[PDB]
């Protein structure tokens, strides 16, 4: 009874997750490697572990509770063990665990076993060790070490020398044998000479590796000697006295001081030996400034009330006060040293309260300070008070940086140059402001990421909104993968690449059709019913519970974005569009149907739709013809804004009327008697229809919150701003290109999405003293290493020659650059080839996939990585075809006689030459000859893929000079792959970050080399390495690592979540706080260096 009152009046116990904050805490970034495992009905991770739950550290349990089936749990329990084994070795040295927080890719990108726990432990360790004298310096130095170890390279060896060395082993290692079998009484020499079976290999220290060191003394008082070796004052002084036999018997003063900062010499026992007697006395004279360390402690409450020193400080401050009336402590104390007549001034006065000159008693207390022995050594300092390269230096603003391109004379220029090399956006924001004043105001509303105010640009809000969508797109992506996990094991996918693609098109059609019924039934108050195919029910369920459909309709209504209330809502909603690809592909197989029929088809619909408004027949035909002209533009990716300003960009009738309801079942009849209907040309895929909608709606929502809820005034504000600069034409083009990028339209260039980079602008001073510049400088030197090794590798191989040489020639370098950059393929005439290759073949078509499926670990890290290479190779092939077609049209006979192998004839060529002459722009081919040259190219595209598999040059391609560089490429890369797997043999994260760079680095090198030559300057490795930085700054290199780790919707979460974690830390730093947590979080680009080491060094190894 009474115990009821006690519990009735208590307060409820807190949750068991309110504690453990900063340890438990985003599941998508942790289950990428297990995505394609089917779910198990009624599985429960807690009920399956049973008694075993008592052997984990409260975060391993967090990582283990995500299992959805027995196999997933079995694999997670395996990964947790490798995670322990890796960190056991690194625990041998405390400092190395501090640098593990910034250099383990699994922990900084995603997929590791706990990330918060490691960071929250590294911060505590860094704080503890400092009790390299402040917590920031411990973080800074922990990475300077662990990266300065010069690597060793393999080299061929002579067999005899190695065998001699190995024979001196065994001997010198068998003298410890007891020899109780076959005693010495029974030994004899064998009648034949033996020889061991060692391999002929050496090891040699590398020569091009840089000598990396970190500066940690700029922001503190320090002593420079001979203006390297770094030591402390209390260490240097002792060495001077010991090796100081040539000093006046001053030596006792040195001994006394040695028992009482940072020092740098530009082997310690010999540095002091190479000094004259005079200098090494000035070294002690400046070391007598030890007072500063003690003046500070008596201003702060460190030396609370300790006698002697506390009284000496008070009676020095009293004298400091006295001199003002009758004739901070640091300046007075410094003047006592660094001047002559100042001392003479104090001699001509006696104290008002004791015997002795004012100067005499002042010195009495300095000895108490820099010695600490209470109140005879005054004679020594008196005589030490009577040009050398030793000085005492106050803190300076600009650190010492080793890289060439970062040095600047003042703090503003250095800050401007540092941020340029990290983020792409900064150099764009800078270039926008040169267009006068109106541009400057408008620039702040589009691209900047303000750190000190609420009003923030449109790109920031769009980035913030685009994460919410992807958190729900992923849950549906993982359901599609699981629906085909059975019936298609990895081995089968590699054999039948073409057919595998249809297994997805079938499910997409089924699910899309199923979601149409349940929407129309929901909207009319009827009842929903399930289907009889078990996959469709699961796919639909994963869609309703995803919940993004209502979220988007709620968000878009926020801020009232134009005519958005007209839309209707339901959990099964899905937009509607036509597809220009399905129209062309259908019109290719059938040639009885011509343009004359599609326009008539749409005319019938348009005439019936607007009957009540008295639509005259002429307008019906005009609208029918303008639904075809702007449908071809959709397939070729030549659209842009300024054509969808009336409303939103997802209605097919508004976009047709703005340019000056469909039955979808009514059947039309063509000339040949074939029947046709508009349903055949509707879009069907789901994911490609979800991402497109989400990306553009995020861009519209972000733009509204910046102050432009409707684009009509957004256009006007640009037209008015451009008419202020000296060249209005360029400014308008720049702003149009920026707006197209923000809204998510194809600009035709090959660049990463604008949302993936930040434009932080804020306090220059606070950033400099945080120490970020030193860490940015280090990561920028290692580029020299990789690029130098790549240039050497090109210089070595025969294929590297003539390939590094075509790039210099003005006759061909320009075309090779265009082929690498994919500038003729991404949009315009030729995109049909890229579309056909992109979504009609699988990883099994590479050929290289078969050759490595068993060395590489046969897991997800193989398939996830191979898509990146597919999407790399398709662009090269398409660019080669595009180049060799224009060359043929130009007049090169040797190309024409190879073009005709696939079906050209005089009739097509004459018309093509005629058409090209009238108009060289040609955003698209004319309707008269479209369907023939289009088929000619597609036939070629297929053939090359079959003959080129091995990495060989087909016989009929011997004419093309540029093709000699592209076709054999994949054999060159395979060489680097073999050497890396001969060094690690695992394919873990560090190996992936090396393979991706091994594939992607050389193309950048060739493009940059071509770019430098045409500008009439010499091409040296340093020049190439510096020019590469203005194409792919550091934060874009990490983009490739993410691209090789995850694919599709899961990529966006990781790529975006790194940037905000950087902005949120630099904002806090700029405000005035420098918590080491902030420094750790503020440099996510530093993760790829250890992976860089493996690739960079591996290119020097012998075969």
């Amino acid at each position: 009874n009474p115990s009821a009152l006690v519990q009735a009046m208590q307060k409820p116990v807190a949750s068991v997750t309110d504690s453990f904050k900063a340890t438990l805490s985003a599941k998508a970034l942790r289950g990428v490697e297990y995505a394609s495992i089917p779910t198990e009905a009624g599985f429960e991770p807690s009920k399956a572990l049973g008694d075993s739950v008592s052997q984990y550290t409260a975060d391993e349990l967090e990582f283990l509770s995500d299992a959805r089936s027995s196999a997933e749990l079995a694999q997670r329990r395996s990964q947790v063990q490798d995670t322990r084994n890796n960190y056991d070795a690194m625990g041998q040295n405390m400092l190395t665990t501090v640098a593990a927080s910034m250099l383990d890719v699994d922990m900084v990108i995603g997929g590791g076993v706990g990330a918060l726990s490691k960071v929250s432990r590294a911060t505590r360790l860094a704080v503890g060790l400092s009790a390299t004298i402040t917590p920031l310096d411990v973080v800074g130095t922990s990475v300077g070490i662990a990266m300065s170890a010069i690597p060793g390279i393999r080299k061929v060896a002579k067999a005899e020398q190695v065998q001699q060395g190995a024979v001196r082993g065994g001997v010198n290692a068998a003298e410890d044998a007891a020899g109780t079998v076959v005693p010495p009484k029974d030994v004899t020499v064998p009648p034949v000479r033996e020889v061991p079976e060692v391999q002929p290999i050496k090891t040699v220290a590398d020569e091009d590796y840089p000598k990396i060191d970190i500066d940690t003394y700029s922001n503190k008082e320090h002593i420079e000697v001979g203006r390297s070796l770094k030591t402390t004052v209390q260490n240097a002084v002792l060495a001077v006295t010991a090796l100081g036999d040539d000093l006046p018997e001053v030596r006792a003063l040195g001994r006394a001081l040695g028992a009482s900062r940072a020092e740098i010499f530009n082997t310690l026992s010999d540095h002091v030996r190479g000094m004259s007697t005079y200098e090494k006395t000035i070294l002690l004279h400046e070391a007598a400034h030890a007072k500063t360390g003690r003046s500070i402690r008596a201003v702060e409450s460190g030396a609370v009330s300790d006698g002697v020193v506390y009284e000496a400080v008070q009676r020095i401050k009293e004298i400091q006060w006295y001199v003002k009336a009758n004739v901070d402590t640091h300046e007075f104390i410094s003047q006592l040293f660094n001047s002559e007549h100042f001392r003479d001034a104090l001699r001509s006065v006696k104290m008002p309260g004791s015997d002795g000159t004012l100067l005499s008693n002042l010195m009495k207390r300095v000895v108490t300070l820099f010695t600490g022995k209470a109140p005879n050594a005054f004679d020594a300092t008196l005589q030490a008070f009577d040009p050398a390269d030793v000085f005492l230096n106050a803190p300076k603003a600009t650190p010492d940086l080793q890289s060439k391109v970062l040095q600047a004379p003042n703090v503003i220029e250095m800050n401007n140059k540092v941020m340029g090399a990290l983020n792409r956006n900064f150099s764009l924001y800078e270039r926008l402001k040169s267009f006068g004043y109106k541009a400057s105001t408008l620039a702040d509303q589009l691209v900047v990421d303000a750190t000190g105010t609420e009003a923030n640009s449109a790109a920031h809000h769009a980035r913030a909104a685009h994460l919410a969508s992807n958190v729900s797109i992923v849950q549906v992506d993982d359901a599609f993968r699981q629906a085909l996990s059975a019936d298609w094991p990895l081995v089968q996918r590699l054999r039948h690449p073409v057919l595998y693609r249809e297994a997805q098109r079938d499910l997409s059609q089924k699910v899309y059709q199923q979601l149409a019924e349940n929407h129309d039934r929901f909207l009319k108050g009827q009842s929903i019913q399930p289907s009889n195919d078990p996959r469709v029910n699961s796919m639909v369920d994963a869609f309703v519970n995803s919940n993004w459909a209502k979220d988007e309709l709620a968000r878009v209504k926020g801020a009232g974005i134009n005519g958005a209330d007209a839309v209707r809502e339901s959990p099964y909603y899905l937009p509607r569009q036509h597809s220009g690809n399905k129209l062309n592909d259908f019109m290719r197989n059938n040639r009885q149907v011509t343009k004359d029929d599609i326009v008539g088809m749409y005319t019938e619909q348009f005439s019936r739709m607007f009957q009540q408004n008295g639509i005259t027949p002429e307008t019906a035909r005009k609208l029918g013809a303008k639904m075809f002209d702007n449908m071809q533009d959709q397939a070729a990716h030549v659209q842009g804004y300024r054509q969808s300003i009336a409303g939103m960009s997802y209605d097919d009738i508004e976009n047709t009327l703005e340019a000056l309801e469909f039955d979808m079942t009514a059947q039309y009849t063509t000339k040949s008697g074939d029947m046709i209907s508009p349903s055949m040309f509707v879009n069907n895929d789901v994911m490609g229809l979800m991402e497109g909608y989400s990306r553009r709606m995020s861009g519209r929502v972000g733009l509204a919150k910046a102050g432009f809820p409707d684009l009509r005034d957004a256009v006007k504000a640009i037209d008015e701003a451009a008419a202020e600069a000296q060249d209005p034409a360029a400014a308008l083009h720049a702003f149009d290109n920026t707006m197209n990028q923000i809204l998510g339209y194809p600009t035709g260039e090959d660049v990463p999405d604008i949302l993936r980079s930040a434009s932080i602008i804020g306090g220059a001073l606070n950033l400099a003293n945080s120490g970020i510049y030193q860490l940015a400088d280090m990561s920028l030197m290692l580029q020299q290493f990789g690029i130098t090794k790549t240039l050497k590798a090109f210089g070595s191989t025969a294929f590297g020659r003539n390939a590094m040489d075509v790039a210099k020639s003005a006759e061909f370098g320009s075309r090779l650059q265009d082929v690498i950059e994919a500038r003729h393929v991404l949009s315009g005439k030729y995109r049909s080839v890229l579309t056909h290759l992109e979504d009609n073949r699988d990883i099994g078509s590479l050929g290289v996939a078969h050759r490595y499926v068993q060395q590489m670990g046969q897991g997800t890290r193989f398939v996830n990585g191979m898509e990146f290479i597919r999407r790399g190779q398709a662009k090269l092939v398409s660019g080669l075809i595009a180049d060799t077609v224009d060359d043929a049209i130009a007049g090169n006979a040797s190309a024409v006689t190879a073009m005709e192998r696939f079906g050209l004839n005089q009739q097509l060529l004459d018309e093509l030459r005629k058409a090209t002459a009238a108009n060289p722009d040609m955003r698209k081919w004319p309707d008269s000859v479209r369907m023939d040259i289009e088929a000619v190219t597609h036939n070629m595209a297929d053939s090359i893929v079959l003959e080129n598999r091995l990495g060989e040059i087909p016989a009929w391609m011997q004419f093309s000079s540029v093709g000699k560089v592209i076709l054999p490429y994949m054999t060159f890369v395979a060489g680097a792959w073999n050497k890396i797997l001969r060094r690690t043999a695992k394919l873990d994260g560090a190996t992936g970050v090396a393979i991706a760079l091994a594939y992607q680095m050389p193309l950048v090198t060739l493009s940059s080399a071509t770019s430098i030559a045409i500008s009439g300057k010499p091409v040296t490795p340093e020049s190439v390495a510096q020019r590469a930085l203005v194409q792919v700054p550091m934060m874009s290199w990490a983009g490739f690592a993410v691209d090789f780790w995850a694919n599709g919707a899961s990529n966006n979460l990781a790529a975006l979540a790194l940037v905000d974690r950087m902005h949120a830390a630099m904002s806090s730093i700029a405000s005035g706080e420098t918590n080491p947590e902030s420094l750790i979080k503020a440099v996510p680009f530093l993760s790829i260096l250890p992976g860089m080491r493996l690739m960079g060094a591996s290119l020097a190894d012998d075969d």
Binding site: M90, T97, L103, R121, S148, A149, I150, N172, G1091
Partner: protein
């Protein structure tokens, strides 16, 4: 276990080596204790029992390289997942003979170095040597050797 030879008549040179090696063992034990404590895996012992536990943990990873001078040299191998992948064998008597050339070269390049420390870098499959000072401070000398040629 320290590897000193003279056991009847000893000079000051042996005393200096013993003094340095005692501090080396103390530093190794401190690192081991810190690593164990951070993971939360320390045993329920105190005082002499804990000292014996730590000494037994450290004792297994000690190897007495032979050549270079009198008294040879003393090294403590780092912890590894499995020895057969990095060192190529599970017996210390072969690694002791194999490390002789590397240790002799390292000491030849840097005469001023008194003690040597060994560490393993899993990311690049590399073995690293570095000179060490008292008070757990580290020097500037360093060297690197791939694992393939060692195996």
């Amino acid at each position: 276990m320290l590897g000193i030879q003279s056991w009847v008549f000893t000079s000051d040179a042996d005393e200096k080596a013993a003094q340095a090696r005692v501090s080396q063992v103390n530093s190794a034990m401190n690192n081991e204790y810190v690593y164990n404590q951070q993971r939360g895996s320390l045993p329920a012992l105190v005082g002499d029992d804990l000292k014996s536990w730590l000494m037994g943990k450290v004792a297994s990873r000690t190897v007495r390289v032979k050549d270079g001078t009198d008294n040879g040299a003393l090294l403590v191998l780092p912890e590894v997942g499995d020895k057969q992948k990095v060192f190529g064998s599970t017996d210390n008597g072969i690694i002791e003979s194999a490390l002789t050339e590397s240790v002799t070269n390292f000491k030849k390049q840097y005469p001023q170095a008194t003690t040597v420390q060994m560490d393993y870098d899993p990311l690049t499959q590399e073995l690293i040597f570095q000179g060490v000072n008292a008070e757990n401070q580290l020097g500037t000398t360093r060297a690197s050797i791939p694992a393939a040629d060692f195996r």
